[PDB]
Amino acid sequence: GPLGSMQNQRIRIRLKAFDHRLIDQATAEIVETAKRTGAQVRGPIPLPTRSRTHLRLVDIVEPTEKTVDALMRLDLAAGVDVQISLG
């Protein structure tokens, strides 16, 4: 897996949505997913914007192989956009 070739053991996840209920549930599921697999969570935080878009940032640290696997099988609600970096 890519985790062994990763200098920074971190999964950074950015969410965008028009509906704050959907973005809050998506964020909750990401956190639950991370913790069930024994990873830790930094954030999540909401970012200010002057538009009708809601923004969330969450970092998953000390991930395990099952974390990556579980994140890659996770379905987000339509209306929620995602960006994932294994930076």
């Binding site: 704050h20 969570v41 935080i45 200010p48």
Partner: protein, 137 residues
Amino acid sequence: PAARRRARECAVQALYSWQLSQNDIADVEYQFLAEQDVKDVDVLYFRELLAGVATNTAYLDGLMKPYLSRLLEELGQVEKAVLRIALYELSKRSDVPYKVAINEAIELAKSFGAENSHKFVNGVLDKAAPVIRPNKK
């Protein structure tokens, strides 16, 4: 002045982390202050808001519940944090004027919430705030 507004904005974010992650408030506080750029933040006041909302959550929400048309857990997460911050100030902070608490809440609901959020937040505070502060000052 502005430093105290920045503390509120940071408290919204940090309180959001605490609601979603269910990490220890003290770890939330430490990590926020360590990682984020808080150069313009009234840090002491940030800590007192965090502590102030975290140890009194059920009491603050209690000042609010009669005025929601819905269950507490149906409220948006950001909405919940902003309101908790405002209600903490109204009930626990005499060094914050009535108008300041309400207006700062309105501005936070604008930055961090939906189009209509500030109107909901203001609606709740219009009912709740006079009960906490009858003379409205």
